[PDB]
Design a protein around this nucleic acid. Structure first.
Ligand SMILES: O=c1ccn([C@H]2C[C@H](O)[C@@H](COP(=O)(O)NP(=O)(O)OP(=O)(O)O)O2)c(=O)[nH]1
Ligand SMILES: [Ca+2]
Ligand SMILES: [Cl-]
Ligand SMILES: [Cl-]
Ligand SMILES: [Mg+2]
Ligand code: NA
Ligand code: NA
Ligand code: NA
Length: 331
DNA sequence: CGGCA
DNA sequence: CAGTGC
DNA sequence: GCCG
DNA sequence: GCACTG
């Protein structure tokens, strides 16, 4: 269990005894990430979380290797940093990385698009604005480039959640609306607001997206849509942009998901995160012959069985994990 | 060797 | 499908 | 990158 | 691990 972050409280990271290592490794991890070397970047990310939660400063190659998530190669970098105070590789990162990071911070442009723009000679957002062929999503991402990189005070996230909740409950007073993500995990600032909507009668969540989005558009609250499949009535998620009324307001990202009550615990667990907490818990489930999604915890396919999970605690229990409140899932 | 949700 | 983001 |  | 685009 020591090897699974989802089995451990994330508060272990608040006492990082190895910051002089992790701040350097994070530079490299991001360099691999924006260049598209996603699995190497994942290994770095996991190693950083292992170093952040370790109980003491690492001081030997043997100690480092013993830590789950640190191997020979990562141990060698750790030993370099301690002796020399520096990591030579940081002076030999691809010169494209700063521009790739600039470009992949456009919403809807990932590593493949950023690398293509770089190959085509683009180096600035002015080059993108004037010369690139943007998708509809990427054009919205660029228009809101700075605002999507800002985090909002959690008090503003509360206002946004309440705006959604009031619009929803206006046409069905029984709808339950909960802000998840970093808000539910108790963070002081939030990159966006992630709102989960359900109805305890098990049926009246159906079809609400059309009414809800139209309502939020009527009041001018929604300003742009990034993902919203409104054509066939099977919509599960909305990703877009909102802005509260009055002066001094920024455009803020807003995510909504609507789920049947029978899936509430698994949807709440997914949407609360964190992302690395979810990936850890889902990996653990696989080792136990199970599969965990926002819909269900289910046994391996043959057509698996859906396990009964009325509450988040039941998912933890079925995976043999001690329960963690949302604030302790911040991996 | 291959997954890594 | 590949690419993208939650 | 690391893991089984 | 899933739901989106085009
Ligand atoms: O890769 C991901 C990203 C998110 N998620 C889940 C967990 C996350 O907490 C939730 C909302 O995604 P956000 O991108 O909104 N992240 P979060 O709310 O944790 O942080 P932020 O403050 O940046 O929005 O979706 C994943 O499972 N995998
Ligand atoms: Ca979100
Ligand atoms: Cl590099
Ligand atoms: Cl619950
Ligand atoms: Mg969020
Ligand atoms: Na190790
Ligand atoms: Na992007
Ligand atoms: Na974010």
């Amino acid at each position: 269990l020591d090897k699974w972050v989802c089995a451990q409280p994330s508060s272990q990271k608040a006492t990082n005894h190895n910051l002089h290592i992790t701040e350097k490794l994070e530079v490299l991890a991001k360099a691999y990430s924006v260049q598209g070397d996603k699995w190497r970047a994942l290994g770095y990310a996991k190693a950083i979380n292992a170093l952040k939660s370790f109980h003491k400063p690492v001081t030997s190659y043997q100690e480092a290797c013993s830590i789950p998530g640190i191997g020979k190669r990562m141990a060698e970098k750790i030993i370099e940093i301690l002796e020399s105070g520096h990591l030579r590789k940081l002076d030999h990162i691809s010169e494209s990385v700063p521009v790739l990071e600039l470009f992949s911070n456009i919403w809807g442009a990932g590593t493949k698009t950023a690398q293509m723009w770089y190959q085509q000679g683009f180096r600035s957002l002015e080059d993108i604005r004037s010369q690139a062929s943007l998708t509809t999503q990427q054009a919205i991402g660029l228009k809101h480039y700075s605002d999507f990189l800002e985090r909002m005070p959690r008090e503003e996230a509360t206002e946004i959640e309440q705006t959604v909740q009031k619009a929803a409950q206006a046409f069905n007073s029984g709808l339950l609306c909960v802000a998840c993500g970093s808000y539910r995990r108790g963070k002081a600032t939030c990159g966006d607001v992630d709102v989960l909507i359900t109805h305890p009668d098990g049926r009246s969540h159906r079809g609400i997206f059309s009414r809800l989005l139209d309502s939020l558009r009527q009041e001018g609250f929604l300003t742009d849509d990034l993902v919203s499949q409104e054509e066939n009535g099977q919509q599960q998620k909305y990703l877009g942009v909102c802005r509260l009324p009055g002066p001094g307001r920024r455009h803020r990202r807003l995510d909504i998901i609507v789920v049947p009550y029978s899936e509430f615990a698994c949807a709440l667990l997914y949407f609360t995160g964190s992302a690395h907490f979810n990936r850890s818990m889902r990996a653990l489930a696989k080792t136990k012959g199970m599969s965990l999604s926002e819909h269900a915890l289910s046994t391996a396919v043959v057509p698996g069985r859906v396990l009964p999970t009325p509450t988040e605690k039941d998912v933890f229990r079925l995976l043999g994990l001690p329960y963690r409140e949302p604030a302790e899932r911040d991996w």
